[PDB]
Short mmCIF file of N, CA, C and O in Angstrom, two decimals:
data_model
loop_
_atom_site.label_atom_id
_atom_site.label_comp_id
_atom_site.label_asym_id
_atom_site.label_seq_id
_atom_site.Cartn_x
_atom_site.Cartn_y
_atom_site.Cartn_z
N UNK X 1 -132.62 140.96 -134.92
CA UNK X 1 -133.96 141.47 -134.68
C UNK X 1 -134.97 140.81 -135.63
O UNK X 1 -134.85 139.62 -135.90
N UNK X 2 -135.87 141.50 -136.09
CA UNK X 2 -137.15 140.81 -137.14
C UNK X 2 -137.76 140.12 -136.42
O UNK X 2 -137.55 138.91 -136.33
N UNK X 3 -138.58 140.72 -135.78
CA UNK X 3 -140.05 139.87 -134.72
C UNK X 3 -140.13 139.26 -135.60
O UNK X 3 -139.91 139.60 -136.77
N UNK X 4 -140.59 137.81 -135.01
CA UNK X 4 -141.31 136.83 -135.74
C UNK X 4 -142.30 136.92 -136.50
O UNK X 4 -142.83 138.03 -136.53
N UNK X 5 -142.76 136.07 -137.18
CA UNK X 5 -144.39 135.88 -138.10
C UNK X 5 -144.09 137.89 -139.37
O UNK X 5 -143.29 138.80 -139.57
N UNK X 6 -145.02 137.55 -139.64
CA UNK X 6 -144.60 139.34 -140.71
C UNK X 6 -144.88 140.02 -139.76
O UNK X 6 -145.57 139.96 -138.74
N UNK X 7 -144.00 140.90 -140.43
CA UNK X 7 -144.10 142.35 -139.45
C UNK X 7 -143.71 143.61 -140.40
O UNK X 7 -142.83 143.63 -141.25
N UNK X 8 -144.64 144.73 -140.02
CA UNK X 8 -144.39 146.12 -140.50
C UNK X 8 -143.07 146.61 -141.43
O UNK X 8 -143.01 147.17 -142.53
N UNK X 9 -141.61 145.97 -140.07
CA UNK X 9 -140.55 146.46 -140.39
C UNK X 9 -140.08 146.16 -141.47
O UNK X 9 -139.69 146.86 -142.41
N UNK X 10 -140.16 144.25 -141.20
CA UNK X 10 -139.52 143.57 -142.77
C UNK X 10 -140.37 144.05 -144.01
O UNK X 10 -140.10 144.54 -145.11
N UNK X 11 -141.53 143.68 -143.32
CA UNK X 11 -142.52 144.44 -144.88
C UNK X 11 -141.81 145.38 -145.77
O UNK X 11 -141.69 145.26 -146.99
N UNK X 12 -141.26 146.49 -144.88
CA UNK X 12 -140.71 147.48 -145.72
C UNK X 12 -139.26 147.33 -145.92
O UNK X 12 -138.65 147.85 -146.85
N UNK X 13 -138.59 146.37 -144.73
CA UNK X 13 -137.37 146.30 -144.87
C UNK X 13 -137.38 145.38 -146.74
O UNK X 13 -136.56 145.75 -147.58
N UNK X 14 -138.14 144.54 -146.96
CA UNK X 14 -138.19 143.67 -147.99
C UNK X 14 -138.36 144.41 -149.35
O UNK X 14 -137.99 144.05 -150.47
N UNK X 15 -139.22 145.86 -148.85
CA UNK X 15 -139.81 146.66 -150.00
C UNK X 15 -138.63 147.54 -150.37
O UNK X 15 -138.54 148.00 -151.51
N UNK X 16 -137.81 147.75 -149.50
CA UNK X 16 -136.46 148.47 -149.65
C UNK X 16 -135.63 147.59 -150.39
O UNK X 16 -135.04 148.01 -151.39
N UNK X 17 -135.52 146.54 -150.05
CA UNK X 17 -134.77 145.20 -150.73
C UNK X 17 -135.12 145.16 -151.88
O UNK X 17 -134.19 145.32 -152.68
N UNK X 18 -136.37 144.96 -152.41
CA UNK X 18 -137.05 144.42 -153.59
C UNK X 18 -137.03 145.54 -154.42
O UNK X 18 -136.86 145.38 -155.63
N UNK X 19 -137.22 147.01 -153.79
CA UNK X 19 -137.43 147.84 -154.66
C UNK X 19 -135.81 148.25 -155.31
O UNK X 19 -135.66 149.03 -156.25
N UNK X 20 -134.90 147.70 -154.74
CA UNK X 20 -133.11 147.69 -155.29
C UNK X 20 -133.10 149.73 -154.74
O UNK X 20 -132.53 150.55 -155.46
N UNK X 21 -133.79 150.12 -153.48
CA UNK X 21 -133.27 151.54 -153.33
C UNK X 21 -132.24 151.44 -152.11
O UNK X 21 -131.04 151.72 -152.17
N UNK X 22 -132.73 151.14 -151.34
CA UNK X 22 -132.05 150.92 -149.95
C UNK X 22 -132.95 150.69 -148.61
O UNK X 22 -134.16 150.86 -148.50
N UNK X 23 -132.30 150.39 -147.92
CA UNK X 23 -133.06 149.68 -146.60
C UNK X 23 -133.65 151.21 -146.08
O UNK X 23 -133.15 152.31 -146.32
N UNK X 24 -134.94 150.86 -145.25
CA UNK X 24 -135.55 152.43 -144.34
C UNK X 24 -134.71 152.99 -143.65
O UNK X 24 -133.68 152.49 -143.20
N UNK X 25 -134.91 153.56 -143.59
CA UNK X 25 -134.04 154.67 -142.51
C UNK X 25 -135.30 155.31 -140.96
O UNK X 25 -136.08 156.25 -140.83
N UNK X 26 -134.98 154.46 -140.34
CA UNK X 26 -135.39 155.16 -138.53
C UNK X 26 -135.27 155.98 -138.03
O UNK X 26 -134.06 156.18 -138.02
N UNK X 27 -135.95 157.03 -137.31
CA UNK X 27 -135.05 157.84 -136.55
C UNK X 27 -136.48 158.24 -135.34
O UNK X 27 -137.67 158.31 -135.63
N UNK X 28 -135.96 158.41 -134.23
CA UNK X 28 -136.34 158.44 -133.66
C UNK X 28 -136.80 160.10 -132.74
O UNK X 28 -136.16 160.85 -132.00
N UNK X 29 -138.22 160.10 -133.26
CA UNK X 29 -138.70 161.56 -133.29
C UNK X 29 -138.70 162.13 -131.65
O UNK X 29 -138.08 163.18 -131.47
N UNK X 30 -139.21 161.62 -130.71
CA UNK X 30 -139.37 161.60 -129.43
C UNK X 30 -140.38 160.67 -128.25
O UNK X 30 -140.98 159.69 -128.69
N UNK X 31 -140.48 160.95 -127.17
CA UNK X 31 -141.00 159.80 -126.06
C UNK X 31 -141.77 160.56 -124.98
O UNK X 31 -141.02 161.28 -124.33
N UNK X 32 -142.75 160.60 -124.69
CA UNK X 32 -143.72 161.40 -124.18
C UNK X 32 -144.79 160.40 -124.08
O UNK X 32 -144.81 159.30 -124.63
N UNK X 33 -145.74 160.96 -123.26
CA UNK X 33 -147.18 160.19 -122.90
C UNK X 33 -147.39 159.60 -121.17
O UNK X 33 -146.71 160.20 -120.34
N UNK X 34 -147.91 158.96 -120.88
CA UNK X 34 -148.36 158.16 -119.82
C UNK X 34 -146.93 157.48 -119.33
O UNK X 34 -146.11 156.93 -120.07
N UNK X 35 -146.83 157.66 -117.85
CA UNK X 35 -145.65 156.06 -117.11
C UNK X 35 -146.32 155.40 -117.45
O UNK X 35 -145.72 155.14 -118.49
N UNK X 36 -147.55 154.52 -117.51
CA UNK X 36 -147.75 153.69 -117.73
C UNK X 36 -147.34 152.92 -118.97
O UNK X 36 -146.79 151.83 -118.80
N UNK X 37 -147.62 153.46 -120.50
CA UNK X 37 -147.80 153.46 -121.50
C UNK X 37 -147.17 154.51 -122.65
O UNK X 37 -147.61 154.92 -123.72
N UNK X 38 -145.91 154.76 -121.92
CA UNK X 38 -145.80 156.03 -122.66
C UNK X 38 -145.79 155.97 -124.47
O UNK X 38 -145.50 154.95 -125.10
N UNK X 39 -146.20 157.34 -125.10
CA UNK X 39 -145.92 157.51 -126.51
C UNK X 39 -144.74 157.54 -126.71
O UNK X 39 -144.22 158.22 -125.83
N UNK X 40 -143.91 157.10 -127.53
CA UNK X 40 -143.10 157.20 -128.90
C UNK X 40 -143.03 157.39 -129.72
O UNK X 40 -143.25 156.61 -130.65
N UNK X 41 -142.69 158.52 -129.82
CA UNK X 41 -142.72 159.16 -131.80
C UNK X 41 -141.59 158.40 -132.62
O UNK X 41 -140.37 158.46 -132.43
N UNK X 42 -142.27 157.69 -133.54
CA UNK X 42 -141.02 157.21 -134.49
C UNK X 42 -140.85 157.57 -135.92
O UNK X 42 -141.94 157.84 -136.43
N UNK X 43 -140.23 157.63 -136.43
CA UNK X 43 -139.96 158.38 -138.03
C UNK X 43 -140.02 157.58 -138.63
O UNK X 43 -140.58 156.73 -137.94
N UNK X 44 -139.79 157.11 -139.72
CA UNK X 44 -139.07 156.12 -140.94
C UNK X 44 -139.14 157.14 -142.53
O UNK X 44 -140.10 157.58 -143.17
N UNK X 45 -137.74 157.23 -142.71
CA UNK X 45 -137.23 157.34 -144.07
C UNK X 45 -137.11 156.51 -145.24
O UNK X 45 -136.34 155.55 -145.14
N UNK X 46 -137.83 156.72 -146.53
CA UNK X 46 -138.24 155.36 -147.33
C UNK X 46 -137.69 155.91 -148.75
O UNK X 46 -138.58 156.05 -149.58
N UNK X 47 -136.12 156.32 -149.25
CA UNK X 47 -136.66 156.92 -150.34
C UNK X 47 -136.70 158.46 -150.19
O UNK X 47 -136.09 159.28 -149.50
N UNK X 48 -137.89 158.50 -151.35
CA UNK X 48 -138.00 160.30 -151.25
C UNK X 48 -139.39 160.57 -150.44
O UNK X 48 -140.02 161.63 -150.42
N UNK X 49 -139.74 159.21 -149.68
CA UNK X 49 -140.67 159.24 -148.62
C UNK X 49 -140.42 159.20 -147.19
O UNK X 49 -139.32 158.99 -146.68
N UNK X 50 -141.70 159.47 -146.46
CA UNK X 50 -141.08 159.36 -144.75
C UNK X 50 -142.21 159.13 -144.03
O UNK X 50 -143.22 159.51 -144.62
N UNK X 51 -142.42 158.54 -142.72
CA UNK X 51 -143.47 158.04 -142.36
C UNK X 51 -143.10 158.47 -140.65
O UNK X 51 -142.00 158.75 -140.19
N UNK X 52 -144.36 158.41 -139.98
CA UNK X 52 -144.38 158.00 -138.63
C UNK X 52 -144.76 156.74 -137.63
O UNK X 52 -145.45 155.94 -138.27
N UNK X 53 -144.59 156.42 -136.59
CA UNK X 53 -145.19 155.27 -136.03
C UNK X 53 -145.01 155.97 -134.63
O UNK X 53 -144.19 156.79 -134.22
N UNK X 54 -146.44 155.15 -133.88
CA UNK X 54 -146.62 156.25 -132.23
C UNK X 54 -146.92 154.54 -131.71
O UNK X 54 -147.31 153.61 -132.41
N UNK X 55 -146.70 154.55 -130.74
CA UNK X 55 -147.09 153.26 -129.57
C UNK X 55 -146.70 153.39 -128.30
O UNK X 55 -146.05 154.35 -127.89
N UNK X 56 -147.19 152.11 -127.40
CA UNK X 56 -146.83 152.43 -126.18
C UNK X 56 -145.06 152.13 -125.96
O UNK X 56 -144.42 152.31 -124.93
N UNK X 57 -144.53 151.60 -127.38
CA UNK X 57 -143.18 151.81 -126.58
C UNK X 57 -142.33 151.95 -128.15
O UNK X 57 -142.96 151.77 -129.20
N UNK X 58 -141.18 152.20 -128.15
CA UNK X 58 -140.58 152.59 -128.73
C UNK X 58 -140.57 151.58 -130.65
O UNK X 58 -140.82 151.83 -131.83
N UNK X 59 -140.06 150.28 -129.68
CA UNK X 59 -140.19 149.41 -130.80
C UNK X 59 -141.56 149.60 -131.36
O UNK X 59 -141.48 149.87 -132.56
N UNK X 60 -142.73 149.56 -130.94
CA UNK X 60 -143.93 149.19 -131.45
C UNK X 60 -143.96 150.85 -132.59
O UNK X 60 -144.09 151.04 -133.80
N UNK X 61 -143.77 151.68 -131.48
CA UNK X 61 -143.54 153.06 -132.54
C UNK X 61 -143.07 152.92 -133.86
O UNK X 61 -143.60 153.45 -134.83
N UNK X 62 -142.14 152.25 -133.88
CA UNK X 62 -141.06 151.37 -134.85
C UNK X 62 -142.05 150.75 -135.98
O UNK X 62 -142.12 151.22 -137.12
N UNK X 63 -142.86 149.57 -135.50
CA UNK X 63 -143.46 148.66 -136.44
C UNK X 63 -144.34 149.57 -136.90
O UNK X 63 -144.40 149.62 -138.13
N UNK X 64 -145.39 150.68 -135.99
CA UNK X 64 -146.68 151.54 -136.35
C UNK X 64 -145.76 152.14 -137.34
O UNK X 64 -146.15 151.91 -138.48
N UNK X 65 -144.80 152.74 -137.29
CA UNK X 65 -144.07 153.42 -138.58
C UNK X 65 -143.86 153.03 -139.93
O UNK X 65 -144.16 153.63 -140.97
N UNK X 66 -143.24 151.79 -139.73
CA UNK X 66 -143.24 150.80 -141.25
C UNK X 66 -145.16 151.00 -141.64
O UNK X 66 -145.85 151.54 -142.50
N UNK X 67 -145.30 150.41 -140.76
CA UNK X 67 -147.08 150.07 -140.94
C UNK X 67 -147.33 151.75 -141.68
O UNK X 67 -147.80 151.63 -142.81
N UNK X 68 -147.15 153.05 -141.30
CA UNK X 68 -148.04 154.04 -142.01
C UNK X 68 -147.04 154.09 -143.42
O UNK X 68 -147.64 154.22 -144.49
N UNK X 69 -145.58 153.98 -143.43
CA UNK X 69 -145.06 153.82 -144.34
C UNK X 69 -145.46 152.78 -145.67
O UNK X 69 -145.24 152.90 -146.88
N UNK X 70 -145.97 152.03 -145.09
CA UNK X 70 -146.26 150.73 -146.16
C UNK X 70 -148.02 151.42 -146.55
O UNK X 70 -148.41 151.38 -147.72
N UNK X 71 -148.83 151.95 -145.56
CA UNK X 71 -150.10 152.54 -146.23
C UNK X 71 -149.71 153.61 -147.25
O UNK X 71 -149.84 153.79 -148.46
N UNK X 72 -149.15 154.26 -146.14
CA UNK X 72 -148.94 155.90 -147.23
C UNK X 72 -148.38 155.48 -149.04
O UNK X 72 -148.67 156.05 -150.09
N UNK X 73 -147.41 154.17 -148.76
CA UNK X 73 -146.81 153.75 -150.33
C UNK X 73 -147.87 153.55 -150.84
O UNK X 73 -148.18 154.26 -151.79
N UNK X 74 -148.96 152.29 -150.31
CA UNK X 74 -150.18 151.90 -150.76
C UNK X 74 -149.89 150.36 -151.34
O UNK X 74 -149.80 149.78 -152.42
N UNK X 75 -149.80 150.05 -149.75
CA UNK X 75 -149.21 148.73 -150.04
C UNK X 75 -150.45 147.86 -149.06
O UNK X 75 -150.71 146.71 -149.41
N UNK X 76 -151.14 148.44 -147.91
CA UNK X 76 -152.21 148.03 -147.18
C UNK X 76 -153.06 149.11 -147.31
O UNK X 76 -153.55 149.38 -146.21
N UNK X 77 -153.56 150.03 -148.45
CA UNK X 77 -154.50 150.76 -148.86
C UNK X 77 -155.64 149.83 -149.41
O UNK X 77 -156.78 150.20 -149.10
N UNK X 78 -155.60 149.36 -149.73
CA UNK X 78 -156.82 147.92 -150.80
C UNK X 78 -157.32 147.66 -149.28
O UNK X 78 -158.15 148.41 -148.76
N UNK X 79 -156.91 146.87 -148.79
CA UNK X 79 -157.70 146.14 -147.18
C UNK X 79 -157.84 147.23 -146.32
O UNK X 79 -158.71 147.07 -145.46
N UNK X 80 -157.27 148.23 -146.28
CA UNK X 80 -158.02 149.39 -145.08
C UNK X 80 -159.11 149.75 -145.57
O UNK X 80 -160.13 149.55 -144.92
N UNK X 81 -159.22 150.57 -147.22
CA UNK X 81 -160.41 150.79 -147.66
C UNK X 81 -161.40 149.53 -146.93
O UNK X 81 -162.18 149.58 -145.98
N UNK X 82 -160.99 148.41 -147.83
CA UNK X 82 -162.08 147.34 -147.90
C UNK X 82 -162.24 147.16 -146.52
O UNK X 82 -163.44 147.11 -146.28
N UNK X 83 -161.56 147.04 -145.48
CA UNK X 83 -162.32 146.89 -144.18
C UNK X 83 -163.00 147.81 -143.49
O UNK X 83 -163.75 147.50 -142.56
N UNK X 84 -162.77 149.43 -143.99
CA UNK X 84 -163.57 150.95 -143.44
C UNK X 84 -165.16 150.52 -144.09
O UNK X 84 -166.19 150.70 -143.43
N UNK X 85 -165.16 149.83 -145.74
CA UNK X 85 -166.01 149.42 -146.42
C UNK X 85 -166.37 148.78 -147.76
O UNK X 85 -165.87 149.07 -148.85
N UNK X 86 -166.84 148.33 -147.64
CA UNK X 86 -166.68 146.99 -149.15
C UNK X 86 -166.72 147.95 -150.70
O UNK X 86 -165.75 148.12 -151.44
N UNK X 87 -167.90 148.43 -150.87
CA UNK X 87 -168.15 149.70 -151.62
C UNK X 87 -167.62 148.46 -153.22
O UNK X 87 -166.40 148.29 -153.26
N UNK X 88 -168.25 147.90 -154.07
CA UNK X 88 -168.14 147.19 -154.62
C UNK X 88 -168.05 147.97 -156.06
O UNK X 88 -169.06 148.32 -156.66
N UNK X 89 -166.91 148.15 -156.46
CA UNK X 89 -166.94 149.22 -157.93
C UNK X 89 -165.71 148.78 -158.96
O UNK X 89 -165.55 149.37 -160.02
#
């Protein structure tokens, strides 16, 4: 697996690596929403942390998960601020 180019998962899969705790832990919350597009609830276990990820499909649920996992650590907190607003301090 490991979509190409960076991605959410390795991000954290690497932060699990680097941090010497252990790799995330997945789990898969539930699947609901639109035929078209349906939601996916996804979990991720980080530690003595835990995160969610929602998308139109399961995997992406997956990456949105690493992705709130890696904010909530405060690992893409600096560039969300700075892109909501510059705020120069």
């Amino acid at each position: 697996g490991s979509s190409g180019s960076s991605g959410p998962i390795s991000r954290l899969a690497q932060i699990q690596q680097a941090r010497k705790e252990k790799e995330p832990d997945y789990i898969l919350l539930s699947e609901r929403g639109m035929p078209r597009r349906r939601e996916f609830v996804m979990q991720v276990k980080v530690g003595n942390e835990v995160a969610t990820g929602t998308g139109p499909n399961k995997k992406i649920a997956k990456k949105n998960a690493a992705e709130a996992m890696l904010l909530q650590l405060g690992y893409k907190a600096s560039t969300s601020l700075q892109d909501s607003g510059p705020s120069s301090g």
